[PDB]
Amino acid sequence: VRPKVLMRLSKTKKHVSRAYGGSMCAKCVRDRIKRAFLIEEQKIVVKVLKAQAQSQK
Amino acid sequence: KIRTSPTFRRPKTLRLRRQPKYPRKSAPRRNKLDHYAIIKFPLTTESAMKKIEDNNTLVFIVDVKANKHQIKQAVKKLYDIDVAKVNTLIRPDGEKKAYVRLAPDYDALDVANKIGI
Amino acid sequence: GRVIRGQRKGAGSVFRAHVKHRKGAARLRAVDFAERHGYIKGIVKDIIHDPGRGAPLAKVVFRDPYRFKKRTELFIAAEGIHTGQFVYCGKKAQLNIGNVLPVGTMPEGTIVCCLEEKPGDRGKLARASGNYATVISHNPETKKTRVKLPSGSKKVISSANRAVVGVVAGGGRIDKPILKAGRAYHKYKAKRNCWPRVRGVAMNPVEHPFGGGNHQHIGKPSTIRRDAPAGRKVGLIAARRTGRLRGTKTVQ
Amino acid sequence: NPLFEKRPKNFGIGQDIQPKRDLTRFVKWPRYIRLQRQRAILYKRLKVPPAINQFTQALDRQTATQLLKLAHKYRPETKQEKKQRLLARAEKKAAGKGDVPTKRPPVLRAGVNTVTTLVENKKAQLVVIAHDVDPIELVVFLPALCRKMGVPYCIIKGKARLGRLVHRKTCTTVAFTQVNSEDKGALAKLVEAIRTNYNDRYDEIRRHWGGNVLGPKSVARIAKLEKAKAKELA
RNA sequence: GGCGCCCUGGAAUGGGUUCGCCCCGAGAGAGGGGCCCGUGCCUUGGAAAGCGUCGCGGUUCCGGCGGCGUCCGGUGAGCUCUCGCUGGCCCUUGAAAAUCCGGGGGAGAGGGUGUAAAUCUCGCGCCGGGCCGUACCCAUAUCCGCAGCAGGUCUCCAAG
RNA sequence: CCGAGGGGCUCUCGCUUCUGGCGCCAAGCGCCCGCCCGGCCGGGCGCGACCCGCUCCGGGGACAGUGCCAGGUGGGGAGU
Ligand SMILES: [Mg+2]
């Protein structure tokens, strides 16, 4: 609808029950969840592979 | 002290209250436009007369500085009657015409009788 | 007695530029502690198009180091970038295409566009579509390097002039003919009010120093001194030679 | 104990947002601030003439506190005690008609225009002179003049402080004419400590130029070139 | 009507589709679902009013009184309007802002129970919405051209 | 440099680079009052986030500029 009529509706007709409800497209939510997961873990991998490098040089 | 911003914005200083020690006009001027000066005279043409019995509305001609809240109390306090709604108009002789509709508790054809027409 | 077309363009009434639908002044980000001492990670969001410019622009967002905010810059889009590319900016940025890093750190013979002509200027030299500048011959004491501008004029500049690596996107733009008068109307509709250029011979002696006569001729020599007054500088201004070219330039 | 954890913030480039640090140098001042600060620099950078440079050589605070202790009981008359002083003269004249009740009320004078009259008549015995006169030509002649009439002078720090002696704001000079003879021995105590420092040194304090030191960011690169010249030789 | 939305599953002997294209292992075809627009139809409004027609009252106010009707279908490169899908063009990329909304965060807040708190963008209910314009012409006669001047003057609607 | 557990003629800095993600409004430590009779709440300060200093940081710099005068040039313009 128009912008000012969004004041008349209720927030059941304006978003979706996911996180990032009426903002994101649900398939980049699916990718933002995987993108945050797979690269917070590799900064644990790159931390510990660096951490065993001072101790065995 | 530390200055966490590179902006030096000027301090909020104290602003006193204007409490003067003599009035500048010595007396509140009176309202020239009161509830008599609002409503000059009623309009008694043929079209206004058949809007009295047909529509429960009586018609005046009102001073042009008067809005509809001022009219609605001015007919209520002069003529001791309830007013439903008011519709104004500037008729091109230059004076404001007001179409005062009454509440259905009252009648227009006898309130017009006690004001003369 | 009447003033001429070349004089009226400085008054700026109907000759002001058409700056409505442009997307902004495309300038590199202002330098601070991050670009003096490290690198900053910025991701290019989009590739946009200024009307009246033939280089495309690229808008990059950067995580703001001082307030929790993101803020958006506009760079001249160096060629070969794509959206969703991380663009690194600072002294210790790694020498890749599209990254921007001071000319004292990149080695000689690299290819640079949009370089600052003085440190902090947010990018002035070699900006138009297809151009590039080459760095040569650093000087580590009295820190100052020279470059090779798109006119072939080599110019010694400061060593900390920040500059984006690569050549400007939109190259080859002048290879296609305009090919008709109507597409030259649309070319200059977006830029200025300069396109239909009436020959000064074709007009009356009030309006140009060459016009008049019963034959369309110049009459007087067309090459003028440089201290000629305003309204007499028409024609070939302060020419070192004329005629069809022999060689390339052969004079510094 | 159960759950609480350290979770520090990396504050290098490209990590967590920098905290609210001091920034009291890098802050855009008003143009009355940096006008007020750049001339304190610019008295230190120009070649200051020795006539202006008589100042910046003031008293040390141990002497200056002894001096204000001496000048404290020679305080001038205020309008509060001027009311009663004209009473006590008039109630006793109404009762006894004293031919001379007080032979010597002593006091210190105030004012440049009054002091200059005392020094060139040699009536003053010690001339306290201020430091921070805003048109410094109001005072610049007076150290050169107390040498010639031989009156001892001392530059004190701060024209606000000797202004409070005379119940005013700034008073730029005071003078000592008639001290009490029982307390001459405190005025004579520090007067050789003073005309050691000002009057006897006049051949040298008139020669001493001022200012002309480069800023610390530019004298540091002077030293770094000299250490490179020092590393060249050895 | 549309979906560049989802699930199962995996396609070459390639297939599916358009007027044109286009589409598919980054998931075709096929099967089942989901949201969006729903200006179309039914329903509430709503038959009481509107009109058509027949008939009888009332000097007069009469938004009189009553009978019956206001029904089925078809077709289209039709015309106008509108919504959508898809392309083409450009050294042409085809406005700003107020306003309104959704999300990310989680400082805080709330009654403490076999009782009810903070809060509520749900369903009702209550009061108010001032001021200025509003007639008429819009022109071979209400405008401008000295005039009821073959001139000039911006648009929307449109049948056989 | 030499060399013995080590010193420093000399130094470099360092804490973010496979990916269209996130990031602020302190965790933690040390202390101190009102608070519990060697225990519990309610607040504040410091470190974390180094100290000092004369320009905000750069680039120019006694030139450029500007003021007055002097000489060139001057149908750009004026008058005839
Ligand atoms: Mg031409």
Short mmCIF file of N, CA and C in Angstrom, two decimals, chain B residues 4-104:
data_model
loop_
_atom_site.label_atom_id
_atom_site.label_comp_id
_atom_site.label_asym_id
_atom_site.label_seq_id
_atom_site.Cartn_x
_atom_site.Cartn_y
_atom_site.Cartn_z
N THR B 4 35.56 14.85 24.89
CA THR B 4 35.39 13.72 23.98
C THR B 4 34.97 14.11 22.57
N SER B 5 34.66 15.37 22.31
CA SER B 5 34.33 15.77 20.96
C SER B 5 35.30 16.83 20.46
N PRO B 6 35.64 16.84 19.17
CA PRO B 6 36.42 17.96 18.63
C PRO B 6 35.61 19.21 18.40
N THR B 7 34.33 19.22 18.74
CA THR B 7 33.50 20.40 18.63
C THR B 7 33.48 21.10 19.98
N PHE B 8 33.76 22.39 19.98
CA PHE B 8 33.50 23.23 21.15
C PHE B 8 32.19 23.94 20.87
N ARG B 9 31.11 23.42 21.42
CA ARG B 9 29.81 24.06 21.32
C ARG B 9 29.56 24.84 22.61
N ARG B 10 28.86 25.97 22.49
CA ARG B 10 28.85 26.95 23.56
C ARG B 10 28.01 26.45 24.73
N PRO B 11 28.35 26.82 25.96
CA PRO B 11 27.65 26.27 27.12
C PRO B 11 26.22 26.76 27.22
N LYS B 12 25.34 25.86 27.64
CA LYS B 12 24.00 26.23 28.07
C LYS B 12 24.08 27.12 29.30
N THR B 13 23.86 28.41 29.14
CA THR B 13 23.92 29.32 30.26
C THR B 13 22.50 29.59 30.74
N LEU B 14 22.40 30.35 31.82
CA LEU B 14 21.12 30.56 32.48
C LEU B 14 20.36 31.64 31.74
N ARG B 15 19.07 31.41 31.53
CA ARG B 15 18.20 32.42 30.93
C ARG B 15 17.14 32.79 31.94
N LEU B 16 17.15 34.04 32.38
CA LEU B 16 16.23 34.54 33.38
C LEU B 16 14.82 34.63 32.83
N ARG B 17 13.89 34.95 33.71
CA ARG B 17 12.51 35.19 33.33
C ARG B 17 12.27 36.69 33.31
N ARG B 18 11.67 37.17 32.23
CA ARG B 18 11.29 38.57 32.11
C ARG B 18 10.24 38.89 33.15
N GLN B 19 10.66 39.47 34.27
CA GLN B 19 9.74 39.97 35.29
C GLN B 19 9.98 41.47 35.41
N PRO B 20 9.27 42.26 34.61
CA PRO B 20 9.52 43.70 34.57
C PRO B 20 8.91 44.39 35.77
N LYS B 21 9.22 45.67 35.93
CA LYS B 21 8.75 46.38 37.11
C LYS B 21 7.86 47.57 36.77
N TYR B 22 7.28 47.59 35.57
CA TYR B 22 6.13 48.44 35.27
C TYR B 22 5.44 47.89 34.04
N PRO B 23 4.11 47.91 33.99
CA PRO B 23 3.42 47.44 32.80
C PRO B 23 3.62 48.39 31.64
N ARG B 24 3.62 47.85 30.44
CA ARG B 24 3.94 48.67 29.29
C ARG B 24 2.72 49.28 28.63
N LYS B 25 1.51 48.81 28.95
CA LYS B 25 0.29 49.43 28.45
C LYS B 25 -0.75 49.69 29.53
N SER B 26 -0.44 49.37 30.79
CA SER B 26 -1.10 49.80 32.02
C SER B 26 -2.47 49.18 32.29
N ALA B 27 -3.05 48.52 31.30
CA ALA B 27 -4.40 47.99 31.39
C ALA B 27 -4.61 47.03 30.24
N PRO B 28 -5.19 45.85 30.48
CA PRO B 28 -5.55 44.97 29.37
C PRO B 28 -6.65 45.62 28.54
N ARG B 29 -6.40 45.75 27.25
CA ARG B 29 -7.41 46.31 26.36
C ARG B 29 -8.60 45.37 26.26
N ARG B 30 -9.78 45.95 26.10
CA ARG B 30 -11.00 45.18 26.08
C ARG B 30 -11.19 44.54 24.72
N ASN B 31 -11.94 43.44 24.70
CA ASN B 31 -12.24 42.80 23.43
C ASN B 31 -13.33 43.58 22.71
N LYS B 32 -12.92 44.25 21.63
CA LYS B 32 -13.85 45.00 20.79
C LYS B 32 -14.86 44.09 20.12
N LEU B 33 -14.46 42.86 19.80
CA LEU B 33 -15.31 41.89 19.14
C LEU B 33 -15.82 40.91 20.19
N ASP B 34 -16.88 41.30 20.87
CA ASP B 34 -17.56 40.36 21.75
C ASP B 34 -18.82 39.86 21.09
N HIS B 35 -19.62 39.14 21.87
CA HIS B 35 -20.74 38.36 21.38
C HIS B 35 -21.89 39.21 20.85
N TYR B 36 -21.88 40.53 21.03
CA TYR B 36 -22.78 41.39 20.28
C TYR B 36 -22.18 41.83 18.96
N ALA B 37 -20.88 42.16 18.97
CA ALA B 37 -20.21 42.60 17.76
C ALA B 37 -19.93 41.46 16.80
N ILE B 38 -20.04 40.21 17.25
CA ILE B 38 -19.97 39.06 16.36
C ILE B 38 -21.06 39.14 15.32
N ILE B 39 -22.29 39.19 15.79
CA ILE B 39 -23.47 38.82 15.03
C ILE B 39 -24.33 40.07 14.86
N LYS B 40 -24.17 40.71 13.72
CA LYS B 40 -24.75 42.01 13.43
C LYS B 40 -26.27 41.99 13.37
N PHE B 41 -26.85 41.24 12.45
CA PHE B 41 -28.29 41.19 12.25
C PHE B 41 -28.64 39.89 11.55
N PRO B 42 -29.88 39.43 11.69
CA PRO B 42 -30.31 38.25 10.93
C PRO B 42 -30.74 38.59 9.52
N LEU B 43 -30.57 37.60 8.64
CA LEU B 43 -30.84 37.78 7.23
C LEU B 43 -32.24 37.27 6.91
N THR B 44 -33.07 38.13 6.34
CA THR B 44 -34.48 37.82 6.16
C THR B 44 -34.92 37.86 4.70
N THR B 45 -34.17 37.24 3.80
CA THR B 45 -34.60 37.15 2.42
C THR B 45 -35.53 35.96 2.24
N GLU B 46 -35.94 35.74 0.99
CA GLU B 46 -36.85 34.64 0.68
C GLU B 46 -36.14 33.30 0.78
N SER B 47 -34.87 33.25 0.40
CA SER B 47 -34.14 32.00 0.46
C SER B 47 -33.71 31.68 1.88
N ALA B 48 -33.48 32.70 2.70
CA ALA B 48 -33.15 32.44 4.09
C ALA B 48 -34.39 32.09 4.89
N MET B 49 -35.56 32.55 4.46
CA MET B 49 -36.77 32.32 5.22
C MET B 49 -37.26 30.90 5.04
N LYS B 50 -37.19 30.38 3.82
CA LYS B 50 -37.52 28.99 3.57
C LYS B 50 -36.35 28.05 3.86
N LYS B 51 -35.29 28.54 4.49
CA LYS B 51 -34.33 27.66 5.13
C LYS B 51 -34.56 27.64 6.63
N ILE B 52 -35.51 28.42 7.13
CA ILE B 52 -35.87 28.38 8.54
C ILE B 52 -36.85 27.27 8.84
N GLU B 53 -37.99 27.21 8.15
CA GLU B 53 -38.93 26.16 8.50
C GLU B 53 -38.58 24.83 7.87
N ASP B 54 -37.85 24.83 6.76
CA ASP B 54 -37.58 23.59 6.08
C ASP B 54 -36.40 22.85 6.67
N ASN B 55 -35.52 23.56 7.37
CA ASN B 55 -34.22 23.01 7.65
C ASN B 55 -33.80 23.17 9.10
N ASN B 56 -34.62 23.84 9.92
CA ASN B 56 -34.36 24.16 11.32
C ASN B 56 -33.08 24.99 11.47
N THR B 57 -32.76 25.81 10.46
CA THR B 57 -31.59 26.68 10.50
C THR B 57 -32.02 28.13 10.37
N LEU B 58 -31.49 28.99 11.23
CA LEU B 58 -31.65 30.43 11.11
C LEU B 58 -30.34 31.09 10.73
N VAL B 59 -30.45 32.15 9.94
CA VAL B 59 -29.33 32.74 9.21
C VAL B 59 -29.05 34.13 9.75
N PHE B 60 -27.79 34.40 10.02
CA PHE B 60 -27.36 35.72 10.43
C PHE B 60 -26.33 36.26 9.45
N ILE B 61 -25.87 37.48 9.71
CA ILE B 61 -24.72 38.05 9.03
C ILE B 61 -23.73 38.49 10.09
N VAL B 62 -22.53 37.93 10.02
CA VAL B 62 -21.60 37.91 11.13
C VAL B 62 -20.37 38.72 10.74
N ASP B 63 -19.76 39.37 11.73
CA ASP B 63 -18.56 40.17 11.50
C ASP B 63 -17.42 39.29 11.04
N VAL B 64 -16.65 39.78 10.06
CA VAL B 64 -15.80 38.90 9.25
C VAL B 64 -14.58 38.36 9.98
N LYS B 65 -14.35 38.79 11.21
CA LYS B 65 -13.24 38.29 12.00
C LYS B 65 -13.66 37.15 12.92
N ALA B 66 -14.87 36.62 12.75
CA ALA B 66 -15.43 35.64 13.66
C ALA B 66 -15.40 34.25 13.06
N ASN B 67 -14.76 33.31 13.76
CA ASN B 67 -14.77 31.93 13.31
C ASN B 67 -15.98 31.21 13.88
N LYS B 68 -16.09 29.92 13.59
CA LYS B 68 -17.32 29.22 13.90
C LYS B 68 -17.45 28.84 15.36
N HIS B 69 -16.35 28.77 16.10
CA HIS B 69 -16.46 28.59 17.54
C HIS B 69 -16.94 29.86 18.20
N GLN B 70 -16.52 31.02 17.70
CA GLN B 70 -17.02 32.27 18.23
C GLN B 70 -18.48 32.48 17.91
N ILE B 71 -18.92 32.06 16.72
CA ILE B 71 -20.33 32.17 16.36
C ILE B 71 -21.18 31.24 17.22
N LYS B 72 -20.71 30.01 17.42
CA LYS B 72 -21.50 28.99 18.10
C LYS B 72 -21.76 29.33 19.56
N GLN B 73 -20.83 30.02 20.23
CA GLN B 73 -21.16 30.50 21.57
C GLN B 73 -21.95 31.80 21.54
N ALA B 74 -21.86 32.56 20.46
CA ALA B 74 -22.52 33.85 20.42
C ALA B 74 -24.01 33.73 20.15
N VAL B 75 -24.47 32.61 19.62
CA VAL B 75 -25.89 32.48 19.35
C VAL B 75 -26.45 31.73 20.55
N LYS B 76 -25.58 30.96 21.20
CA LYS B 76 -25.95 30.21 22.38
C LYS B 76 -26.16 31.10 23.59
N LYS B 77 -25.38 32.17 23.71
CA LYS B 77 -25.47 33.02 24.89
C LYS B 77 -26.42 34.18 24.68
N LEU B 78 -26.57 34.67 23.46
CA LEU B 78 -27.58 35.70 23.24
C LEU B 78 -28.99 35.13 23.24
N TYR B 79 -29.20 34.00 22.57
CA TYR B 79 -30.55 33.54 22.28
C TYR B 79 -30.94 32.30 23.05
N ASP B 80 -30.06 31.81 23.91
CA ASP B 80 -30.34 30.80 24.93
C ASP B 80 -30.77 29.47 24.29
N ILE B 81 -30.03 29.06 23.27
CA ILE B 81 -30.39 27.92 22.43
C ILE B 81 -29.15 27.12 22.09
N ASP B 82 -29.36 25.84 21.78
CA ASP B 82 -28.28 24.96 21.39
C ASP B 82 -28.06 25.01 19.89
N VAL B 83 -26.80 24.94 19.48
CA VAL B 83 -26.43 25.06 18.08
C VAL B 83 -25.82 23.74 17.64
N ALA B 84 -26.31 23.20 16.54
CA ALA B 84 -25.78 21.93 16.06
C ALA B 84 -24.47 22.13 15.31
N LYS B 85 -24.51 22.90 14.22
CA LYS B 85 -23.33 23.17 13.43
C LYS B 85 -23.50 24.52 12.75
N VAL B 86 -22.38 25.09 12.31
CA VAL B 86 -22.34 26.39 11.66
C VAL B 86 -21.62 26.23 10.33
N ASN B 87 -22.10 26.91 9.30
CA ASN B 87 -21.43 26.93 8.00
C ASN B 87 -21.32 28.37 7.54
N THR B 88 -20.10 28.87 7.41
CA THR B 88 -19.88 30.25 7.04
C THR B 88 -19.64 30.39 5.54
N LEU B 89 -19.53 31.64 5.11
CA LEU B 89 -19.55 32.06 3.73
C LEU B 89 -19.24 33.54 3.72
N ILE B 90 -18.45 33.98 2.76
CA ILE B 90 -18.16 35.40 2.59
C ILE B 90 -18.97 35.86 1.39
N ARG B 91 -20.05 36.52 1.63
CA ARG B 91 -20.81 36.85 0.44
C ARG B 91 -20.33 38.17 -0.15
N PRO B 92 -20.28 38.28 -1.50
CA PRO B 92 -19.38 39.26 -2.14
C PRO B 92 -19.72 40.73 -1.98
N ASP B 93 -20.65 41.07 -1.09
CA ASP B 93 -20.69 42.43 -0.58
C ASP B 93 -19.64 42.64 0.49
N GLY B 94 -19.08 41.57 1.02
CA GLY B 94 -17.95 41.64 1.92
C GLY B 94 -18.24 41.23 3.33
N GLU B 95 -19.46 40.86 3.68
CA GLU B 95 -19.79 40.49 5.04
C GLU B 95 -20.03 38.99 5.12
N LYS B 96 -19.66 38.41 6.25
CA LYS B 96 -19.70 36.97 6.41
C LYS B 96 -21.11 36.53 6.76
N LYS B 97 -21.62 35.57 6.00
CA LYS B 97 -22.94 34.99 6.23
C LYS B 97 -22.75 33.68 6.97
N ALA B 98 -23.57 33.43 7.98
CA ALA B 98 -23.46 32.19 8.74
C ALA B 98 -24.79 31.46 8.79
N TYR B 99 -24.74 30.17 8.49
CA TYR B 99 -25.91 29.30 8.45
C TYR B 99 -25.94 28.47 9.72
N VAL B 100 -26.59 28.98 10.75
CA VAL B 100 -26.59 28.34 12.05
C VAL B 100 -27.72 27.33 12.07
N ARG B 101 -27.37 26.05 12.13
CA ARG B 101 -28.34 24.99 12.28
C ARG B 101 -28.59 24.73 13.76
N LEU B 102 -29.83 24.48 14.13
CA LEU B 102 -30.15 24.22 15.52
C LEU B 102 -30.09 22.73 15.81
N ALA B 103 -29.92 22.42 17.09
CA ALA B 103 -30.11 21.06 17.55
C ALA B 103 -31.60 20.72 17.46
N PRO B 104 -31.95 19.46 17.21
CA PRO B 104 -33.36 19.13 16.97
C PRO B 104 -34.25 19.24 18.19
#
